[PDB]
């Protein structure tokens, strides 16, 4: 009955950022010692707990949360950050607690000549609430006159792509990030550790 | 780790062709990463000159050509230019971030078939002012010869001047010949107690004189 | 279209700080990484270095031990670099280089665009203003020598730029004091020293000096 932290770290396909994918832990005992111990990860940083307690505790809701950004926008994924991807694609609460894992993704999410499949939300009329899930193409808004679906002045499409090359800069390359987040409601405590 | 290796200097006469290596690691060159050759001109600040390891800005002209293969790079330019005489610099990234940009060593490319130019020597005395703040320099100035290589020598009126010789290198003209500078310092009182002074420069066997007196 | 020009250099005492600035213009300043590279004088190009385009991102290579900081001011589309625990080494000219466009493929790779460079001295010694002495005089030699000064460099117009055929302006040279000389000539036909005035203009930004010197031919 071990949790199913494989079949997310190793996928061989991600999300994107805006619509980033969400996989819910229960029933399982759960191994932090193979993440934590595993030196391939760029980023790894817990916020409320530390990766060596974690195989001593039990939650009752984990939840891993995967998705592709840029490498300089992996320091938005942290409590109390702003920028276009905490504001508008993936928003952390203050009180979050659990740890976010960030890995350089080059050699499989860039390909020659531009990977434009992974995409980020540019523009949104309000920040985004912690843990909510915006996947809406509608025209932003971004004036006086509307838009009645087309674009152009104050008109644009909120969804951009990335454009990732192997040949970019360390900021400009992809990186696969899974944050876990450990909540402990008034539940069971289904996942736990060795 | 540490920075990329270049010949440090090529030559060439104008119409030949002409290359200039870039030996990178996999860290760098081997690791996919593209390599770009900044041109500095003496004086100024580099250019860009290649991008992409293949791919030219505007202005370059076709005779200028890149290439990469493996941990290496090179750097081709075909029918050579006096104005072309510059230093050429390779670059290169390194996914670690302690290092990314590394830098190439530096190549230095001299165009050949130039006519060897007798010196251009012109001196000159103290001036008045610095007569009456208690100072006198002597100012001999060398251009337009070629190649770069030149001995100064002072006479104190037949004799040795060697302290308070200051004499500079000879640098790169733009119009590809070289440049000289040589200073002689003393009070008032030694330039005046000498009938003449003379600044003498030997080129490639060949002796021009200036000579200035305090009259 | 694309302009860098960089100031602040000058002497600045070993183990201390200095600000260097750099003001761009001519493209969207926060669409681009920036850096900043150093050359030693007459040596070879090390990358100093790099912000990203909104500002929040540094790199730095582990040679400069993290006393180097790089920042950006999108309100006056400026770049800082801030030095500290400065040493004789980091005597150089610095440069500071807009990156490649977000939508190539050598996108944080290279330096496209480079700016004029400024000259950082660190040195124990004194900073020191220049003396300029007039070299007076068919074609004859018109001069005039900039003399004990500290640190380089300095730079020299004729006429307030206007004229620039014959102009030779010559490499400085080290005294055993300590204080750098250099001198800049000019070849002018004999005639036109009876009727033309000859006003050369020397600019020492380090001391923040300049000088309008009037040379004249005597006798
Ligand atoms: C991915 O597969 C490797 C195969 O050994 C395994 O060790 C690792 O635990 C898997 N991913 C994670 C993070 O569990």
Same mark, same amino acid.
């Given at each position: 009955?071990?949790?199913?932290?494989?079949?997310?770290?190793?996928?061989?396909?991600?999300?994107?950022?805006?619509?980033?994918?969400?996989?819910?832990?229960?029933?399982?005992?759960?191994?932090?010692?193979?993440?934590?111990?595993?030196?391939?990860?760029?980023?790894?940083?817990?916020?409320?707990?530390?990766?060596?307690?974690?195989?001593?505790?039990?939650?009752?809701?984990?939840?891993?949360?995967?998705?592709?950004?840029?490498?300089?926008?992996?320091?938005?994924?942290?409590?109390?950050?702003?920028?276009?991807?905490?504001?508008?694609?993936?928003?952390?609460?203050?009180?979050?607690?659990?740890?976010?894992?960030?890995?350089?993704?080059?050699?499989?999410?860039?390909?020659?000549?531009?990977?434009?499949?992974?995409?980020?939300?540019?523009?949104?009329?309000?920040?985004?609430?912690?843990?909510?899930?915006?996947?809406?193409?509608?025209?932003?808004?971004?004036?006086?006159?509307?838009?009645?679906?087309?674009?152009?002045?104050?008109?644009?499409?909120?969804?951009?792509?990335?454009?990732?090359?192997?040949?970019?800069?360390?900021?400009?390359?992809?990186?696969?990030?899974?944050?876990?987040?450990?909540?402990?409601?008034?539940?069971?405590?289904?996942?736990?550790?060795? | 780790? $540490?920075? @990329?290796?270049?010949?440090? *200097?090529? %030559?060439?006469?104008? /119409?030949?062709?002409?290359?200039? &290596?870039?030996?990178? #690691?996999?860290?760098?060159?081997?690791?996919?990463?593209?390599?770009?050759?900044?041109?500095?001109?003496?004086?100024?600040? $580099?250019? @860009?000159?290649?991008?992409? *390891?293949? %791919?030219?800005?505007? /202005?370059?002209?076709?005779?200028? &050509?890149?290439?990469? #293969?493996?941990?290496?790079?090179?750097?081709?330019?075909?029918?050579?230019?006096?104005?072309?005489?510059?230093?050429?610099?390779?670059?290169?990234?390194?996914?670690?971030?302690?290092?990314?940009?590394?830098?190439?060593?530096?190549?230095?490319?001299?165009?050949?078939?130039?006519?060897?130019?007798?010196?251009?020597?012109?001196?000159?005395?103290?001036?008045?002012?610095?007569?009456?703040?208690?100072?006198?320099?002597?100012?001999?100035?060398?251009?337009?010869?070629?190649?770069?290589?030149?001995?100064?020598?002072?006479?104190?009126?037949?004799?040795?001047?060697?302290?308070?010789?200051?004499?500079?290198?000879?640098?790169?003209?733009?119009?590809?010949?070289?440049?000289?500078?040589?200073?002689?310092?003393?009070?008032?009182?030694?330039?005046?107690?000498?009938?003449?002074?003379?600044?003498?420069?030997?080129?490639?066997?060949?002796?021009?004189?200036?000579?200035?007196?305090?009259? | 279209?694309?302009?860098?020009?960089?100031?602040?250099?000058?002497?600045?005492?070993?183990?201390?700080?200095?600000?260097?600035?750099?003001?761009?213009?001519?493209?969207?300043?926060?669409?681009?990484?920036?850096?900043?590279?150093?050359?030693?004088?007459?040596?070879?190009?090390?990358?100093?270095?790099?912000?990203?385009?909104?500002?929040?991102?540094?790199?730095?290579?582990?040679?400069?031990?993290?006393?180097?900081?790089?920042?950006?001011?999108?309100?006056?589309?400026?770049?800082?670099?801030?030095?500290?625990?400065?040493?004789?080494?980091?005597?150089?000219?610095?440069?500071?280089?807009?990156?490649?466009?977000?939508?190539?493929?050598?996108?944080?790779?290279?330096?496209?665009?480079?700016?004029?460079?400024?000259?950082?001295?660190?040195?124990?010694?004194?900073?020191?203003?220049?003396?300029?002495?007039?070299?007076?005089?068919?074609?004859?030699?018109?001069?005039?020598?900039?003399?004990?000064?500290?640190?380089?460099?300095?730079?020299?117009?004729?006429?307030?730029?206007?004229?620039?055929?014959?102009?030779?302006?010559?490499?400085?040279?080290?005294?055993?004091?300590?204080?750098?000389?250099?001198?800049?000539?000019?070849?002018?036909?004999?005639?036109?020293?009876?009727?033309?005035?000859?006003?050369?203009?020397?600019?020492?930004?380090?001391?923040?000096?300049?000088?309008?010197?009037?040379?004249?031919?005597?006798?």
């Amino acid at each position: 009955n071990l949790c199913p932290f494989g079949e997310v770290f190793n996928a061989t396909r991600f999300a994107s950022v805006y619509a980033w994918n969400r996989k819910r832990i229960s029933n399982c005992v759960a191994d932090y010692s193979v993440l934590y111990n595993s030196a391939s990860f760029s980023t790894f940083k817990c916020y409320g707990v530390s990766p060596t307690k974690l195989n001593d505790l039990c939650f009752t809701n984990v939840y891993a949360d995967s998705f592709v950004i840029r490498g300089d926008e992996v320091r938005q994924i942290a409590p109390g950050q702003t920028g276009k991807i905490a504001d508008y694609n993936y928003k952390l609460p203050d009180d979050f607690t659990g740890c976010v894992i960030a890995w350089n993704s080059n050699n499989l999410d860039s390909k020659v000549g531009g990977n434009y499949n992974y995409l980020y939300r540019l523009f949104r009329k309000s920040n985004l609430k912690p843990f909510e899930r915006d996947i809406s193409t509608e025209i932003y808004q971004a004036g006086s006159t509307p838009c009645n679906g087309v674009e152009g002045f104050n008109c644009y499409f909120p969804l951009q792509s990335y454009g990732f090359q192997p040949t970019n800069g360390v900021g400009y390359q992809p990186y696969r990030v899974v944050v876990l987040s450990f909540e402990l409601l008034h539940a069971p405590a289904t996942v736990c550790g060795p | 780790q $540490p920075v @990329l290796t270049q010949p440090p *200097s090529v %030559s060439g006469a104008p /119409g030949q062709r002409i290359t200039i &290596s870039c030996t990178g #690691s996999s860290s760098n060159i081997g690791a996919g990463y593209d390599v770009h050759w900044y041109q500095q001109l003496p004086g100024t600040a $580099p250019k @860009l000159l290649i991008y992409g *390891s293949s %791919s030219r800005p505007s /202005g370059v002209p076709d005779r200028f &050509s890149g290439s990469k #293969s493996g941990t290496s790079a090179s750097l081709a330019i075909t029918g050579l230019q006096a104005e072309d005489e510059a230093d050429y610099y390779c670059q290169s990234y390194d996914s670690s971030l302690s290092v990314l940009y590394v830098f190439g060593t530096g190549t230095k490319v001299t165009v050949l078939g130039q006519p060897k130019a007798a010196p251009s020597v012109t001196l000159f005395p103290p001036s008045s002012e610095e007569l009456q703040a208690n100072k006198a320099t002597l100012v001999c100035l060398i251009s337009d010869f070629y190649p770069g290589a030149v001995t100064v020598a002072w006479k104190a009126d037949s004799s040795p001047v060697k302290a308070g010789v200051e004499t500079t290198t000879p640098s790169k003209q733009s119009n590809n010949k070289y440049a000289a500078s040589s200073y002689l310092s003393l009070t008032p009182e030694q330039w005046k107690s000498h009938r003449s002074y003379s600044c003498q420069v030997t080129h490639e066997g060949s002796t021009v004189e200036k000579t200035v007196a305090p009259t | 279209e694309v302009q860098l020009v960089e100031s602040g250099g000058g002497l600045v005492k070993p183990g201390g700080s200095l600000r260097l600035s750099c003001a761009a213009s001519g493209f969207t300043f926060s669409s681009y990484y920036m850096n900043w590279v150093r050359q030693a004088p007459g040596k070879g190009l090390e990358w100093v270095s790099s912000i990203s385009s909104d500002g929040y991102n540094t790199y730095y290579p582990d040679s400069l031990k993290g006393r180097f900081t790089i920042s950006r001011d999108s309100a006056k589309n400026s770049l800082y670099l801030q030095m500290n625990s400065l040493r004789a080494d980091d005597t150089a000219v610095y440069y500071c280089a807009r990156d490649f466009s977000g939508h190539t493929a050598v996108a944080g790779t290279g330096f496209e665009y480079w700016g004029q460079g400024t000259l950082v001295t660190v040195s124990s010694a004194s900073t020191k203003g220049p003396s300029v002495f007039p070299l007076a005089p068919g074609t004859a030699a018109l001069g005039c020598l900039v003399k004990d000064y500290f640190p380089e460099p300095v730079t020299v117009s004729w006429n307030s730029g206007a004229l620039t055929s014959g102009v030779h302006t010559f490499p400085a040279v080290l005294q055993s004091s300590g204080l750098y000389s250099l001198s800049s000539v000019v070849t002018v036909p004999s005639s036109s020293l009876g009727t033309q005035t000859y006003i050369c203009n020397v600019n020492h930004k380090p001391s923040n000096t300049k000088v309008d010197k009037k040379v004249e031919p005597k006798s």
